[PDB]
Amino acid sequence: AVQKMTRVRVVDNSALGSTPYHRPPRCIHVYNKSGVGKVGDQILLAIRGQKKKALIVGHRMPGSRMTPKFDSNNVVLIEDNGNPVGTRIKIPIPTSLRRREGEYSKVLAIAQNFV
Amino acid sequence: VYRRLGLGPESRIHLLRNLLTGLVRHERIEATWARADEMRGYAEKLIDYGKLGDTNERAMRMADFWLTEKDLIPKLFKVLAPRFQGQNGNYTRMLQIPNRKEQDRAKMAVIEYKGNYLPPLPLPHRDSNLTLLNQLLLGLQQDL
């Protein structure tokens, strides 16, 4: 359940995300009609003093039955043009994003590990 | 499913422990109706623990805690448990007594262990079949 604050982990090879930084990440905006951000929901993340759009791929909030509950909040950065900021994703990514309404093929085309 | 009694959850059990210990010692106790009803379930379940067996180690821990006076522990396994072996339940008889005339008008009841040596309580009696209405019902029963 991504929401105000909610320390997150940037699962991407983007230069801003890849480089370690002292400041804990305070996510700003959730790109949904509702205020809660879950897997597959676009969000705005502040990394390295910059603002970049991110896509949630995992959360620690209890989920529906028959689904894996992640132990860490995982996100993937997406450019303004719609292409992912990073060319690779390391954490296992649920395959439900394909059926989820929206544009998720590009991110799935970047996710090596599927669970 | 539980009455809100005592200054805390411990007090209710301790108060129930005090009530349970007294009833076992005397086998007939007069108390407020609400308390008697609340503790009636515990007393019946305690008899089941006695029926479970004296050798049952768990029963001793329950009996030891609930019964402050330890002389009662042999009594439960050797008096109460043998007494109720035939019975499958209803070990305790609770009846309503007129409210205390102590200016607070508390609802009073008497709870006793069945099979006790104490004099029988004045229980209510249903109407005899010799009554006119019962005799009329008897005729209907015979015809059917």
Partner: protein
């Protein structure tokens, strides 16, 4: 004192007579119900063919609870359980004498004990030849769909796949509330159990478990005339034109014992 005294049915009953009284009550209930089992064999009122604008009678059912139900698509749908108990037509009101627009039929279910009920209620039911029912409700029924009083009504009146409207009193919460009649509209029926007269209805229904509810055909404009393809007056087991399956399922519903669904 030459004054009134308070009495109950068991006050003057002896143990031997009390046991007999229970047996007698059971015998009366059995005999009365069996007598009313066959409506069509008891001089039924004339039944008319369906025409547009006809309205069928509703039923009263008990809310058993909710359980998960699965469809052939593999999705899980929570469904609420409604049981029709001792549903019988009691009193018919003429169109003019009740409402100029339409006539109404009174239906009562969930038989109740006779010991703690007023004699007036028992007197009416004695004429009807049925044991007293917990709730009396009025349903607007057209003249063509009128059914003779005392006709048993079963869950088979409704069929799987039909949307229905359920109205029931909401759970009361005390001073803080609730305990108000409310209606839920557009609930589809997933399955009906004929043997136990259990109807499986999509969604939740107001009220607590084991709470009586009123069930009537959906009044939404889209489902204006659904009774054309359904038993128009009602389903008569007495007629036995075709014995229905014990459990009625919707086509999408995945019956238990079917092969495991594979998403191909």
């Amino acid at each position: 004192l030459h004054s009134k005294s308070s009495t109950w049915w068991d006050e003057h009953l002896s143990e031997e007579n009390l046991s007999f009284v229970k047996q007698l009550v059971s015998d009366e209930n059995k005999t009365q119900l069996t007598s009313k089992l066959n409506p069509l064999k008891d001089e039924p009122w004339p039944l008319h063919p369906w025409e547009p604008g006809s309205f069928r009678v509703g039923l009263i059912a008990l809310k058993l609870g909710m359980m998960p139900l699965w469809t052939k698509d593999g999705q899980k749908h929570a469904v609420t359980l409604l049981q029709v108990q001792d549903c019988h037509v009691l009193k018919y009101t003429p169109k003019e004498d009740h409402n100029g627009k339409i006539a109404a039929l009174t239906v009562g279910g969930k038989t109740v004990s006779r010991f703690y009920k007023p004699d007036s209620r028992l007197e009416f039911y004695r004429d009807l030849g049925l044991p007293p029912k917990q709730i009396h409700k009025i349903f607007h029924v057209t003249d063509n769909a009128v059914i003779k009083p005392g006709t048993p009504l079963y869950a088979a009146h409704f069929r799987p796949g039909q949307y229905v409207d359920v109205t029931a009193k909401t759970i009361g919460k005390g001073f803080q509330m609730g305990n108000q009649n409310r209606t839920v509209y557009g609930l589809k029926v997933w399955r009906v159990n004929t043997k136990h007269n259990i109807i499986y209805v999509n969604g939740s229904v107001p009220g607590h478990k084991n709470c009586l509810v009123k069930i009537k055909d959906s009044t939404l404009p889209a489902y204006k005339d659904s009774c054309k393809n359904l038993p128009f007056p009602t389903y008569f087991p007495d007629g036995d034109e075709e014995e229905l399956p014990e459990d009625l399922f919707d086509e999408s519903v995945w019956q238990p014992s079917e092969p495991s669904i594979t998403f191909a």
